[PDB]
Every structure is written in structure tokens, then in C-alpha cells.
Write a protein that binds this ligand. Sequence first.
Ligand SMILES: NC(=O)c1ccc[n+]([C@@H]2O[C@H](COP(=O)([O-])OP(=O)(O)OC[C@H]3O[C@@H](n4cnc5c(N)ncnc54)[C@H](OP(=O)(O)O)[C@@H]3O)[C@@H](O)[C@H]2O)c1
Ligand SMILES: NC(=O)c1ccc[n+]([C@@H]2O[C@H](COP(=O)([O-])OP(=O)(O)OC[C@H]3O[C@@H](n4cnc5c(N)ncnc54)[C@H](OP(=O)(O)O)[C@@H]3O)[C@@H](O)[C@H]2O)c1
Ligand SMILES: NC(=O)c1ccc[n+]([C@@H]2O[C@H](COP(=O)([O-])OP(=O)(O)OC[C@H]3O[C@@H](n4cnc5c(N)ncnc54)[C@H](OP(=O)(O)O)[C@@H]3O)[C@@H](O)[C@H]2O)c1
Lengths: 467, 467, 460
Amino acid sequence: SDYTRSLFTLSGPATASEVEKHIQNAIEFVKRRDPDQVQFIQAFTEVANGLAPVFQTDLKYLEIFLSLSEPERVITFKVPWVNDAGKLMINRGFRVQFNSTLGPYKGGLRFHPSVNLSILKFLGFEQIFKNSLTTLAMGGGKGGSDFDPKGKSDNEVRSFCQSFMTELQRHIGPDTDVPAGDIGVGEREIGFMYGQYKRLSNSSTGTLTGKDPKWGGSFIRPQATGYGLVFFVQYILNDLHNGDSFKGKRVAISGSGNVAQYAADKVIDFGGIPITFSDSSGYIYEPNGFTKEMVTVLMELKNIQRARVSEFLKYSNTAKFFPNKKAWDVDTNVNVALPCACENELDKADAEMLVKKGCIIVGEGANMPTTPEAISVFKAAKVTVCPGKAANAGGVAVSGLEMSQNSQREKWTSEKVLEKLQDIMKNMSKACQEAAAKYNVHGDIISGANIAGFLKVAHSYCDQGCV
Amino acid sequence: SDYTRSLFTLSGPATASEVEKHIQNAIEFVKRRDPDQVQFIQAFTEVANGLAPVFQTDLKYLEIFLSLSEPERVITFKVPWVNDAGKLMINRGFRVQFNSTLGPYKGGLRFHPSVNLSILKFLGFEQIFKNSLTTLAMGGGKGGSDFDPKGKSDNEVRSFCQSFMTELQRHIGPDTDVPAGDIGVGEREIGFMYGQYKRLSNSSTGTLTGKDPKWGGSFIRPQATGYGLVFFVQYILNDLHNGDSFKGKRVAISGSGNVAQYAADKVIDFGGIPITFSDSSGYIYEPNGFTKEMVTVLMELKNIQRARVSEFLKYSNTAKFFPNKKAWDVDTNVNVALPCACENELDKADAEMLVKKGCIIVGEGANMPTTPEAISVFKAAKVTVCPGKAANAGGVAVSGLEMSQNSQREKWTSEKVLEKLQDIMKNMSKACQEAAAKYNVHGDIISGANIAGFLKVAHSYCDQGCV
Amino acid sequence: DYTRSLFTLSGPATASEVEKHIQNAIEFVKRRDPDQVQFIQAFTEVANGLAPVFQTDLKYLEIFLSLSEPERVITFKVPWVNDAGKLMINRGFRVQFNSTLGPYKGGLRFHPSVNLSILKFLGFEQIFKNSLTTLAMGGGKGGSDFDPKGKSDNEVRSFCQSFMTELQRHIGPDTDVPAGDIGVGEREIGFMYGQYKRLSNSSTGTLTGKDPKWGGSFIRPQATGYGLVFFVQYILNDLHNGDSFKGKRVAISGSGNVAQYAADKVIDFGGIPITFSDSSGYIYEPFTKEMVTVLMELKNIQRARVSEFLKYSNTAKFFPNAWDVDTNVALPCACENELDKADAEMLVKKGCIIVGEGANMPTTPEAISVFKAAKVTVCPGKAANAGGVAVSGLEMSQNSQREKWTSEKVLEKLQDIMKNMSKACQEAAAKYNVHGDIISGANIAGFLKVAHSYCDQGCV
Ligand SMILES: NC(=O)c1ccc[n+]([C@@H]2O[C@H](COP(=O)([O-])OP(=O)(O)OC[C@H]3O[C@@H](n4cnc5c(N)ncnc54)[C@H](OP(=O)(O)O)[C@@H]3O)[C@@H](O)[C@H]2O)c1
Ligand SMILES: NC(=O)c1ccc[n+]([C@@H]2O[C@H](COP(=O)([O-])OP(=O)(O)OC[C@H]3O[C@@H](n4cnc5c(N)ncnc54)[C@H](OP(=O)(O)O)[C@@H]3O)[C@@H](O)[C@H]2O)c1
Ligand SMILES: NC(=O)c1ccc[n+]([C@@H]2O[C@H](COP(=O)([O-])OP(=O)(O)OC[C@H]3O[C@@H](n4cnc5c(N)ncnc54)[C@H](OP(=O)(O)O)[C@@H]3O)[C@@H](O)[C@H]2O)c1
């Protein structure tokens, strides 16, 4: 029942070495088209290599992957605005509308002086497949500006947000493109942009996500990524570790932001014991673990005071702080590791420590926390690694549930949103295992997440005539 | 109260003979407007004759009926496309937007060399009143082209589908007109047309039904018509036969396609015993019935092997095959007959056999299976006949549920779709019973389906000012 | 100035200070687009030509910098199926740079070399060339890396239709009117117009370069050559005290459409075209209208060399491997950098008083210094070869009026555009204290009309 077979030049099975040669030809082609987009080339390389098992079954999938690598539409535009000194400023705005096969373009907006086309293309490309994994009808996109919010008054941010949306509104809509927040775009910016969009469009629709619950926002948004991480690991523990669970397990958490805080809260609900938190200055350790009340104290320190983790020692006599050390160094048995801080935070040496300390599963809350060599250590040790692209998708999944609520003109209760998120992570975990088994890398959830995300997009793309 | 009375020339009660004359005047008027639309004239005649009891209460309903017989909008358009040899081809495309009183125009697309305006008008006119019966907010329409898919490559169908949708997209939309599949338009064509519509409109909406579950499709689509038939008959048995049920009932099913297969499955869920299946070559018979396992084997033979019913004897020692005979000929008591093969399959002699064999109810899975002379035999014998326009509407009902899921941006589970389909058939059966009791006679479900479908449109038409 | 308070830089500056500020502007442009080599060079060259304006008020350098950011750039995937039935994906672009003076206007280029940096450089320069025409046209440029060579007519048709299926969403008669360029001629304009009309369900002037049977204009082939002669003639009257082409021996380089029709209009003005050229060599006849027709037919149908025509004229002489022929007005109409320092000294010694550029940048910088010292006026190409874009604007006017003009009416309007363009260049040169420098005057006039209008409109 393949109606698009004739369109593709490459076809049929291939050996592993043949597939790498074809992947190299694809990477070179991407290089020639965009010679200096370093981040985008690297993202294409990583995703392609993660799909090698699929390409071995049929090389047509590599051709589909290459055709998806070209964005459907990119809009770059001048943004004029007047600052509080009365001077004209000009910034660059972007919206990369990468793929809409499974639904409207979906993806955050980043306001940061480092923003450029290469960065937004790399984030938008990966966003296609993370959004695919949520099982929701969402395509992939990303946008933003080189506008730097730092040092700017509230009114200057309002002026820029209004000018930025004056152009962007022409290209977005509730069934077309639904942007969201990112670095530099939080509740303040989403509100300013929503007001401008509503005024110009003369409509109240779900054209942005991350909105305040008072006007179209959703519950569980702050907790989504941390909770979704724990839901995913809990389901992987049951399915792959023969009925195991978080109950009674000591959990080493890195990071102390929203992902780490709310992952800790859900671990406690499941009976686990979170023992560590961390930041760039060091890590704190509670030998008998953190309680919900203790996590609340930490949340106030990080979210209100924006303090270092060492400050928690003022509130707990049992807590110990270790400067310039990672959470993985803690001297105690650790049964579960949840890196929720930043990319490359868990390296080869960290993985070797955790294996000896008794770690059975790793759950990635941050993006690409585990180094390639650390993943090799865990694979050899038979320690399951839950990939971030599936496990940390709770935030975008709730963004889709926000679109659903706006489409339904109904605000769900917090309990209903939480049930929907857990069920999404349940279905996502099953899809990863099934994809891994079908392609003969059983138990490789990292491969299963790459395969499941890509294949739904690829098959639908051919269903739709490859346009 | 009555706010439109002054608008109508015909009014008031009328005798049966007066109504017969007025129907003739209406038919002649329809002929003069479209002298050579043979199928449309016949469709207008058959629906009109089924509504005589309503016209006897108030002739204004005949004037409303005549006004509904003129489509709100018909669009015909040239469709240029280039075949695989590089030669320009021109086909004719159509969209008959017949009525939108109860909701957006809803109806399938047919690609077949026989397609013309008269055929699409007859299907679109009748579709108004079946879609009304689903209780859902759907109008009536039909479209397609004289394009002949036979002998065409996948690429040639893709080329035609894109050019066809290039024009059609201008006249349809999620709140305006939602086409679907039909003969010559299956998933391949729905996929190709959806991709083109998405590209031109720059939107992801439920503007087509019959979509794949990966991008906006619904569960229960294969099972919808067979399940809905059994749901409808079950409710008629409870309401009209004083708590009767499918439990313990021997069910003679004709046909061996999708309707027959899934009707048997739902019969088993309700405790009935399906004893027969049939095709053009003959019928097979199981004295003690078919199990779900036996139906599964039959489904594989028909859907994959494309075999005849006789092949099933290879898998069952209890099965018996009778060549060149109808399922109604089976020598055993039959309590329920479900004709699911084709029009006019159950004639006067077959009905006389079925009454003597103990048949208490007939449920039409196919279109017009029961001949007029067979219906008279059933009426005298007090055998309930469930009209097909209500009993086989499960497919269109699920298409409405697909629109609901797209509007809500939420994919329902199989179980939720099935419950909603069952509730639709419950309210449809109650409405048919109530209309028959109020206007013609208790237990005449055929009259009740004609009346209930028409009156919801007619009263809504007057509510809306007859525009 | 209602916008004075908006600008950080203000007030007069010395020549060295302007050089410092221009360098700061260039560095800012590089960091934003580090690898857009052609665009950086384009920003640099245009900025240096405006240094006299910047010295009067640094506000203009800040305006120039804000103009260097496109209003809108759209890049899009173009899927199409070739004659073998295989899916092909190409990249399409539309750089909508500036709309201050009117709808975005600029050609479409289909060539494998096409990329964002090139289209930005052409689109930026197009803003100021279109401003010089005096017509209400902004600046833009677009195209695709699609390569027409080796493609069948049907493959070009399929690509053009898919390309326009996306492009139609962003263009329109009052919004953006694309045109042809390398790789986009009558064939492609026709295919794209058909797709646009079908999707938009309208017949409007959203493309220029259209066939006269459906919205096209006369004088389209002849515009650039005719406009060059008009511009030089008006400069001769204005700056050389009533001088004219009549009786003047005209050394013309090249043998394309520009050189041919420039020769035809030179003859109409009473001048004597003495030279033509090709890459293999140049011919010199101590030519008539009949001879030019033969030369055009021989070159345009046979695709022959100029030497082949020398067999057809006994008076013609061919020199293998145009300024070198010696005899008692120079019009370079062949290619860039064709006129070097030594050639300028040759021509000055031969007595040439005016140079008219039909090609892009024919005269080297060192040659311009030689002509400047000799007081030989050089008419910049960006004004003199703008006749094609001017007639494209006249095509928009005819479409807006739903009236097809006679050939005579189109030609009169093209001539009047060049009369007003030459005056605007001269007056700008006088106001900024470089009298007779038509090159600077063309740079100044094109920029100032956009910049002042940009401030009038609130700098949005
Ligand atoms: N929706 C989401 O939130 C979401 C979803 C998927 C992935 N992610 C990824 O998750 C990470 C951030 O999660 P978040 O939202 O909780 O962000 P956040 O609020 O910035 O928290 C990040 C935490 O990591 C810490 N950190 C950074 N570098 C570190 C290092 N080298 N060693 C130890 N701690 C370090 C930070 O401490 P300092 O304050 O000292 O830097 C902070 O406590 C990023 O990688 C992000 O891309 C987030
Ligand atoms: N499924 C739906 O969406 C839907 C909805 C409403 C109404 N219907 C109607 O229901 C009927 C069947 O639908 P389906 O989906 O089951 O189609 P199908 O898959 O073609 O099955 C039709 C069955 O009837 C048999 N048949 C045809 N002519 C016959 C004859 N003269 N005597 C005995 N058997 C005969 C066919 O056997 P052969 O292979 O020998 O022909 C086949 O097994 C048609 O009237 C259709 O229009 C279907
Ligand atoms: N035509 C327009 O609409 C237009 C408008 C504005 C500006 N221009 C500019 O004008 C220039 C030429 O335009 P065109 O219409 O004449 O193009 P064309 O019709 O292709 O003719 C160009 C001619 O120049 C010749 N040539 C190339 N390099 C040469 C060299 N080094 N010495 C002598 N001759 C050389 C070529 O001779 P061969 O036959 O041996 O190749 C060719 O015949 C280009 O720079 C173009 O951008 C054109």
C-alpha cells in the first residue's frame, strides 16, 4: 500500500557501512546548501546517525529525511521599535516554519543576542520529532530575535514585543503556527505579544501557548517537564525492569530549576527518595532525602531568591554542601539518576561512578545531558537510559493540551490535565519500546525514541504526497 | 410558534389523494427545470412519496421540500493535469453543496467515468436527510470528477488530485464544506488531496474526513457501518419488542465484506449467533454459528486472499456451502435477518421464507436491500424492517465524530468513539420510533426514518428564515 | 525634521570622521551576516559613494544602516516532480527589501549559484536604482537554486508552478511585483503568471515582463539601449552647453541587445556608430541602420562572431583580441571592467568627452580618475541602464490603467524619465559640491529620495 515509491531514487535494504556512506553524502549535501550553519549541520548529523537502523531496512527513508531537512517556510523580518530614550532601534526577527505534516507549526520563541538562523533551524528541526513523540497533532517550528531583554525596562520590552508581533501575526494563526516561550520569552513577553496579536487580528484564539490561566492558559505548565520525566521513567521501570518502580529508590538529581524541583515532587509521590540537588557552584546532599516540605524551601530559594544551593544548609542541619562537584560524586548508593541541569553534564567518569553506586536507570530532564561515552558506559553496564527527546517532552505535550483547551473553549481542571500528561507519557514509552523491538535493537529506548518520532512524520509525509 | 406561515403558498391539511396530485405537480416542475437528470428526478420522487403523512398534516412541508430540492451552490470546474507521458489532460470536477441548514456541507467525493451532475445531485439530495438522521450538525453534499483511476499510475493520480484540490480548496473549509471518500477516492486520494489543501491554505484543519489516524483520522472507521447496524437493531428490539435483544437470536447475514464482517462481530458481543455469510457465488452456513475466531479467518480470506466464501470450509468441518443460492434459503429457524450485500437482494419470495422461518426483524446494512414487494410481506407479518438510510449511517456518523475530534484537537480512544457511535444510534432509533408513532403508525420504522430525517431539516429551515 | 529625535548620530562630520563611522557600520553589518560576502561588499560600495551626504549629517548613515535590513525575507521549500517521476526539492527566495517608495520591485533569478547573500546584494542595490527611475517602486529580488539547464519545457513548467504556489501568498499588484532575470525569461514568466492567476482567480499586474497579448508593454527589448542614449544626450545638452550626439563618432562595445539598440537610437539622434565588439575581437567601419539590422540578425540568429559580419561588409575591418581603434563619445555596453586606465588615456587623447555605461560597472576606478582629471563626464550605469526597470514601471502603470499604450507613448515616457533622471543627478551633484560628477549625483539622488521618504513615514 505504498503510493509514493516511484518518487524516491534510493530504495531497498543496505548494509551498515553502506548506510554510513549514504549518510555522509547527505551531510555533505546539507553542508553545501548551508556552508556556515554549524549548529544546524551538527543537528542533522546527530538525528541522521540515530536513524541508521531504519535506513538499513529501506534507503528511501534517508531520502525522506533529507527532504524534511529543508524548512517549508522561513520568514525573516526587520523589527523597528523606539526605546525609552526616544531612539530608533532595529532588530532581526525570525520564524522558521519547518514542518506541518502532523499539524500546525509548533515551537518556542527565543529573544537573545546570540539568536541567528542556524540556531533556530537546528532547534526547529529537532522540534519536529519531539513534538511528534507527544502523539499530539503538532508540527515543528522555532523563532525569535537577536533582541536582548537584559537591561531593558518593562516599557521597552512592551514596545519591542508589539512591533515584533505586528509582522509575525501575518504568518501565524491557531490552525497555522502556534509559537510559545523560550529563553528570553516568558510570561511577560507572551502577554505583551498576545495583546498585540488580539488587537490586530480582532480575535481571541489559541495562537500562542504559555498563556496565563486567566486568559486561555493551562494548569500544570510549570510542572510539566519535571512531572513528565518521572512518569516516563516510572513506566520504563515497570515495562523493562519487570515491575520495578520508584518506591524506595534513592534518586540523584542534578540541577535545581523547575525541571529538577518538580521531578523531585513527583518522585516523592511515587515513593522515591530524592537525595541531591545541584547547580554550577556545587551539589547538596541529604542522607535521608528531601521531603516535600524541604523541596518547598528549596523552590523558594531558587525561584524567589535565585540563590545558590549552598544556601539550603541554612535551613537544614542534616544537609551537606560540596563545592565544585557534580551530584554524581555523592558517596552513597544511588538507584536512579536524573540529570536535569544542562547538556554534557554527565560524562564518562560520572557514568562509571553511578554504575558502581548501583544506578539502574537514567532519566534525562535536560537536553543531551549524557555524553556519548557515558551512554556507552551505561549500555555496557545494562543501565537503561531514557532519552531526553522523549522523557523531557512533557512541556510541549502540555502546550498541545493548551491548544486543545483553546480549541474546545474549555479550561480543564488541574487533575484532568495531569491525567492527560501521564497517559501521553504512557503511550510515548510504549511507542519507544515497540519501535526498538521492530528494528531489532530491543531495550534501546534512545533508538526507539528516534525511530518513533521520525517514522510518524515520514509515513504521514508520504501519505500527503510529499508536499 | 409559526413565524414563516405567510411565506408559503401551499398550506393546511390535505387528503391522501390531494397529496398524490401535489406530488405529481412537484415532480413535473422538477422535471421541467432539469429534463434529463434522470437519477435526480427519481431521487426527488422516492423521498417525496415517503413523506406523504407529513404533507397530509400540512402542505407547507411539500413547498419546503421543493425548495430544498434546489442546491444552494453547485461548482463545476475544469481540472487540467499532466499524465506520465507528459500530455495535458482535462477532466470535469464538481462540488454539489446542496444544503447547510443543520451544518457544513458534508458528503463524499467520487472519481469514476460515470460521474455527472445528475448522479451527484441525487446522492447529495439524499445525503442531506441521512446526515440529519445521525443527529449531528452536518449538512448535505456530494462531489467528484469523471476522472477514471483505472490504469493510472500513483503519480498520475497524485497529479490529478493536486490540480483538483487547487480549485476545490477555494470553496470548502472546516466550517463550510467537509468532503470525504467514496468510489475512486480512498486513503490514497484523501492523502494526496489533504497535502495540497494544507499547502495552499497554510493550515491543518479537519476539512476532509476519512483521514489517516496519524494526521487527524478517527478510530472505528472500518467497523462503523457494521457496528451501527447492530446497535440500531438492538435498540429497536428493546424499545419495540418489549425488552427483546440479540441474545440467543440466530442471525442470517448476507454478504461477506466489511459491513457483514463487523456486524457479525458486534452480534457476538451482544450474544447473538451469526449463522450465515454470502457472496455472489453462494452462501455458507454454520449450524451452531460462527465464533469470533471463525469470523477472523473469514476476514483474512476476503480481505487478503480475495477468496470466495466456499474457501471457509477448508478451515471448518462444520461449515456447509450452497452454490447459487441466497442466505435467506438456509434451512433453519432465523430470528434476525441482516442483508449486507446489495440492493434488491431480498425479494418477495425471500421475505415469505423468512417469515415462516421465524424472522422478527430485518436490519438493512446494504442500500435498499429489500424490494417493495418484500417490504409489504414483512408489514403484513408484523416483521420490523429497519431502513438502511438510518441503520447503515454509522459510517457517516463516525465521519461527524472525526470532525468533532479535529475541532477539539484531541484524538479519542477506540472505546470513546465506540460509545459515541452507540449513543448516536440510540437517539436515532428513538427519533424514528417517535416520528412513526406521531405521524403515521407505531412500529413503522421506515416511515419514521423518512419523517425524522426530513422534519429536522425543514423545521430548522423555517427557524432560519428559509434562506 | 520630525524624526530628528529618533537618531543617535547627528550633525556634520569631517571626511576622516565619516571614514571612521562607515567602518563601524560595515563591522556591524559583518557581525550580523558574517559570510554574506556579496552583501557586505554591496553595503560597503554604496556607503562609500554616499560619503559626501554623510559629511553634511551623520543621520544619513544611521538611516542607511536601517535600510540595510530587509523588511521581509521569505525562503521556502519547492517540491516538484521531474519527467522521470522523481521528487525534487529546491530552495526559493523572495527578498522584500524596501517598500518606502512603492511595491517591492525586482527580478527573479533561477541559477544554481543563487543564495541569500547574492539576492540581498542585488535587492539592496535595486532599491536605489528603482528610486532613480522617479517611479513609485521599492526594491526586492528573488529566485531559486533550481538550474534550468538540461531541463525539459515540462520540467520548467512543473517547477514554475510549484514555485509560484508558495510565492503567490506573499506578492501582489500593490505589494510585490517580481520580474525576470537570469534563468527567468518569457517562458518562465508565462508559466508563473498562469499559476498565479489560477490560484488568485484574478488578472493583475503582479509580474512584469509579460507578453503584450496579456498585459505586456512595448519597448521591452529596446529599453536599456534606448535609455542609455537618452541619458547621455540630456547630459550633453545640460553640461556641455547644448552639445548633442549629432555628428559624433561613437565607440560602442558589445554586440548584445544593449549595444544594438543604443546604436539604433544613436543613429536616430544623428550620431555615427563607428565600432562594435565581441569577446573574440572588435570591428571598426570608418554603421548604417541596414547594417545594424544585418549585424543583429547575424548575431541573434546565427550566434556568429562579429568577424562573420566583416565578410558581409567590405568596408568593415576586424581586429582580433573597441577603444583601440583610432579615429576622431564612448558607450561601453558589453561587460564589467571592460574600460581600464590605459583605455581611458587612449580615449582622452582621441578626444572623447562623455562615457555612457550600458553594462554594469564597465569603467574601472582608475579610469574614472583619468576621466575626472581630463574633465570627461562619466554617466553612471545605475542611471543610464535603468531603462529596463523604468519600462517595467510603465508596464505596472498600464496594468493599473487597464490600457495598452502605443509604442510611441511608451517611448516618450521612457525619454521623459531619463530627462528627469539626468537633471536629478546633476542637481544633487551641485548641492553636495561635486559639480559635474554624475556618478556621485546618481548615488545621492537615489538614496536621498528613499531616506527622506523613510523619515516622512515615521521610520517603520
Ligand atoms: N520545558 C523545559 O523546561 C525543558 C524541556 C526540555 C529540556 N529542557 C532542558 O533542561 C535544562 C534546563 O531545565 P530548567 O527549565 O529547569 O532550566 P533552569 O531553570 O535554567 O535550570 C537549569 C539548572 O541547571 C543548573 N546548571 C547549569 N549548568 C550546570 C552545571 N554545569 N552543573 C550543575 N548545574 C548546572 C542551573 O544552575 P545555575 O543557576 O548555577 O546555572 C539550574 O539550576 C536545559 O538543558 C533545557 O534545554 C527544559
Ligand atoms: N461500508 C459502508 O460504508 C457502507 C455504508 C452504507 C451502505 N453500505 C452498503 O452496504 C452494502 C455492502 O457494503 P460493504 O462495505 O460490505 O461492501 P463490499 O465490501 O463490496 O461487500 C459486499 C458483499 O456483498 C456481496 N454481494 C454483492 N452482490 C451480491 C449478490 N447479488 N448476491 C449476494 N452477495 C452479493 C459481495 O460479494 P461479491 O464479492 O461476490 O460481490 C460482498 O461479499 C452495499 O450496498 C453498500 O453500498 C456500505
Ligand atoms: N539587457 C538588459 O535588460 C540589461 C539591463 C541592465 C543592465 N544590463 C547589463 O548589461 C550587460 C550586458 O547586457 P546585454 O543585454 O548586452 O547581454 P547579452 O545580450 O547576453 O550580450 C552580452 C554581450 O557581451 C559580450 N561580452 C562578454 N564579455 C565581453 C568582453 N570581455 N568583451 C566584449 N564583449 C563581451 C558577449 O559576447 P559573446 O557573444 O562572445 O558572449 C555578448 O554578446 C550585463 O552586464 C548586464 O547586467 C542588461
